[PDB]
Amino acid sequence: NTIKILRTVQQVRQWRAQCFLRNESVGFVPTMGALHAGHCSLINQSIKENDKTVVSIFVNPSQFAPHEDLDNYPRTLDHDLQILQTNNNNNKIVDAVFVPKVSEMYPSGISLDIGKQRGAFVTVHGSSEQLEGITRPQFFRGVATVVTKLLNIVQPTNIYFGQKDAQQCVVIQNLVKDLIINTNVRIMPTLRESNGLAMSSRNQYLSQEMKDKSSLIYQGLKTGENYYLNHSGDKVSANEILQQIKPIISSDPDFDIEYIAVSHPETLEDLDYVVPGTGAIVSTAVKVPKENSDEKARLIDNIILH
């Protein structure tokens, strides 16, 4: 009837053991808090597909680099609980939310200084170094490590991720494949504002004109997608797809394009051709102006070719 807040691993074990006893499937949505409509899309899918659903809220230290001041990451638990309650008014419910301390998730300790780290860590080699990993070479080892721990605590039937973090989704798919984990990885299409802007935590605090300006990014990617579709079931030049997107995201002089890539959906290696039956991940990272000064927000988005 109401959401159980689980603070410790043993509390989750007890909660999950009762799900086991009841023969209930268990969906799992991992988050770092600061919930928004995108997270609710995942949660609502978990509720459709599973008898019971649990959400985690944990700001994972090991995906941050030492030069980042992790102490100013926003803690918004009361807000997040409200999101979860308001979404529940709009539907089974979210049954439990897991909000651990760092020491529960890292019983042997954790440092941002990799030279000081101790204990078990997981690296998905070959999925972690390119694209988003270039500016954050430590990031996907942190992600794979904490998702492994969460999967071992919750032991879900299904775990849910949003397509907007495309490389992250590939890292998790290969994590589950390679560690041979008994869970389904469910990748949900990105939830978008009306104008096509991918949902993010920035959205709700930007002016309408700000969000409208940023919707050009998706508009660029959609043009590349429409190009590939018209050419069918013969292979399509990846570079020719890139030439449809870049001039459109370039149409705004204020945007700084960090990359636009056409990548194999399993190995993330650059493609020369997109083949129907295999497809591609077409992803980008773009710097857009924030509100004032020279501070700029880094937005990512992508579209999947099949």
Add this chain to the structure above:
Amino acid sequence: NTIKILRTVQQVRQWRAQCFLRNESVGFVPTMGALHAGHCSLINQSIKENDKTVVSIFVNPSQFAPHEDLDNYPRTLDHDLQILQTNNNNNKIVDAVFVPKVSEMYPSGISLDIGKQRGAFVTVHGSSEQLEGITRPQFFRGVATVVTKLLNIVQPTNIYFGQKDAQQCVVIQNLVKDLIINTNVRIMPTLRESNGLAMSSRNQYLSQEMKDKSSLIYQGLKTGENYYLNHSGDKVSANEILQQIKPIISSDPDFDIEYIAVSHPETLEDLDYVVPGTGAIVSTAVKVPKENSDEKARLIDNIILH
């Protein structure tokens, strides 16, 4: 009634799902084949403690280094099946044995060349670099990676290891602690020949005088243990314990002592004092003559202080 040979992950999933349906606890003994009485001691404990028991036989490539010719590791499956049947005559039974191909355990491929490796790997930092890891710096990453995969395939209630590989046991205990895995790690005392020699695969093919000569190693360690016991519940100098052992293993001029260590049972850092209530792992690696020429066998053994 007879042992099911499971070849694929899906076969194990089906077998384990029937154990789940039957509400049966599941004990698990992982091996690389070439079974001997030591393995049977683990298996017999698993049968005492669990409704169902499964053994794996898998020579794991990722714990070997490129200069090692993995192709001459002995494959003895028919022999191992005989061990498992003969031990079963002496008792529930071993219900299943899992004998996978490399490609099933490494779906993204495997190389001994670490620079060519791809996919998820697990490292237990801080437990992997000292002692046995000095001559084999790649070894315990290989071990932690394959045990993680096996634990995710079998999903056992209990997993069994022998104390003789003391560092290996610490690596697995910290693996399960740090990845927060829902299994008990059961460490069984080392099974020994009558003269005290730790059971190994070499034993059965050495002359009686060969095994009798090698029993000096355990005899050295036992003297250090008896020293620590007499001093009680005050702390005991670790170096003074070492001075009881080394002259005894040195009594044979043919033995080459690689190390003798007094180590913290959780961090494996060198101890200056062994404190009752914490204790220590006292371990050694010794080169002894093999049969002829200059080839020498590397033996390891240890004793646990409490």
